[PDB]
Design a binder for this molecule. Sequence first.
Ligand SMILES: O=P(O)(O)OC[C@H]1O[C@H](O[C@@H]2[C@H](O)[C@@H](O[C@@H]3[C@H](O)[C@@H](O)O[C@H](CO)[C@H]3O)O[C@H](CO)[C@H]2O)[C@@H](O)[C@@H](O)[C@@H]1O
Ligand SMILES: O=P(O)(O)OC[C@H]1O[C@H](O[C@@H]2[C@H](O)[C@@H](O[C@@H]3[C@H](O)[C@@H](O)O[C@H](CO)[C@H]3O)O[C@H](CO)[C@H]2O)[C@@H](O)[C@@H](O)[C@@H]1O
Ligand SMILES: *[C@@H]1O[C@H](CO)[C@@H](O[C@@H]2O[C@H](CO)[C@@H](O)[C@H](O)[C@H]2NC(C)=O)[C@H](O)[C@H]1NC(C)=O
Ligand SMILES: *[C@@H]1O[C@H](CO)[C@@H](O[C@@H]2O[C@H](CO)[C@@H](O)[C@H](O)[C@H]2NC(C)=O)[C@H](O)[C@H]1NC(C)=O
Ligand SMILES: [Mn+2]
Ligand SMILES: [Mn+2]
Lengths: 152, 152
Amino acid sequence: EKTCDLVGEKGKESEKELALLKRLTPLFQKSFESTVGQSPDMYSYVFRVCREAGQHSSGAGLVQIQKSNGKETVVGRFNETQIFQGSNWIMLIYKGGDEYDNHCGREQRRAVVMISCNRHTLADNFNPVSEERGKVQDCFYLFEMDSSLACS
Amino acid sequence: EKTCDLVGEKGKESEKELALLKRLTPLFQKSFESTVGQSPDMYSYVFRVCREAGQHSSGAGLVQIQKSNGKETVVGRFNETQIFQGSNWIMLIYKGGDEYDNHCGREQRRAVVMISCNRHTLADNFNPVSEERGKVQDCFYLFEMDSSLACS
Ligand SMILES: O=P(O)(O)OC[C@H]1O[C@H](O[C@@H]2[C@H](O)[C@@H](O[C@@H]3[C@H](O)[C@@H](O)O[C@H](CO)[C@H]3O)O[C@H](CO)[C@H]2O)[C@@H](O)[C@@H](O)[C@@H]1O
Ligand SMILES: O=P(O)(O)OC[C@H]1O[C@H](O[C@@H]2[C@H](O)[C@@H](O[C@@H]3[C@H](O)[C@@H](O)O[C@H](CO)[C@H]3O)O[C@H](CO)[C@H]2O)[C@@H](O)[C@@H](O)[C@@H]1O
Ligand SMILES: *[C@@H]1O[C@H](CO)[C@@H](O[C@@H]2O[C@H](CO)[C@@H](O)[C@H](O)[C@H]2NC(C)=O)[C@H](O)[C@H]1NC(C)=O
Ligand SMILES: *[C@@H]1O[C@H](CO)[C@@H](O[C@@H]2O[C@H](CO)[C@@H](O)[C@H](O)[C@H]2NC(C)=O)[C@H](O)[C@H]1NC(C)=O
Ligand SMILES: [Mn+2]
Ligand SMILES: [Mn+2]
């Protein structure tokens, strides 16, 4: 599809989530990236809101590129989106990423993005915070970003 | 004595989560309450970190008391805890609450607590933000709270 897909058959989706996706529409045409870590784990993270961020038309909402060997790993897909907000933040979650091999019980990767309110920018300061891969399940990659859209 | 239980058997639990729980130790002996809503949906929410919040020994970390009939409902149990942090926030989740009867595919209720950094207080401003009960699954109750412990 062209945009984010929420849980629930068409018509049985949360009115709250739908309204939030609409609120983030200005960000759809943007692309965000951040390179972090040192060899052999230097990565380049590419994140997009409800739009393809990879190069294989797999529906990746956020990908990780092994700088060493140009390996592209899907961290999360926008067809499995969850989104909710607090008083001055919005959390976006892309599930359905590529499966781990020797971690987290071979579960699919998932991307968690915490968008904090910042009245001075529409979108800025995207950066990978950490990766939790030491659990038997429910692992994830955490990212943060600023946006005036998360201000209520 | 009991405490928060993390996913996975002892020995294979996240050292990250284990460390976060210790960081929240000072809050274990505290109790938080907030009454919200309008009749007949007026509720009293009692929150406790890794300690019994209910008066029925159900292992509840957060309960919802219906002010009209005093009916106590478990929102989340501390034996099913998840916890992680970002730059200036910590998110705590209690799953395994009482099952919905006519919402969310009858799944168990869950509590999501967003703890924001506030260097002026150790713990304050516990506030029920909202309840997402219009999804086919993955519903939840959202709460917010301030704490110096969430400051990095
Ligand atoms: O549990 P997994 O699936 O074995 O690893 C998860 C881990 O993957 C990414 O990190 C990289 C890998 O650990 C590993 O990659 C290998 C290379 O791509 C290549 O040699 O081929 C192997 C066979 O497919 C790969 O396993 O080693 C890299 C170098 O240390 C490492 O960066 C990354 O997605 C990370 O976040 C995941 O946790
Ligand atoms: O999907 P459910 O199980 O139908 O409920 C969701 C909803 O439950 C809670 O709030 C209360 C309930 O909707 C409902 O409860 C009944 C009354 O308390 C009383 O007449 O006793 C019955 C015994 O079975 C109760 O089921 O109606 C209440 C009045 O409007 C309402 O407050 C609460 O947990 C809420 O957060 C959940 O979303
Ligand atoms: C989200 O989109 C992906 C991309 O197609 C779906 O992919 C599953 O992809 C694996 C290969 O990576 C296949 O073996 C499966 O057969 C795929 N699904 C389908 C529908 O063909 C994924 O299923 C999608 N998730 C949801 C919830 O729709
Ligand atoms: C968390 O605690 C609850 C409460 O003791 C556990 O639920 C008991 O769960 C078993 C199923 O495993 C049931 O047969 C009982 O009837 C339950 N009690 C209640 C109040 O529901 C739950 O299993 C525990 N979960 C974990 C992961 O330890
Ligand atoms: Mn790998
Ligand atoms: Mn009920």
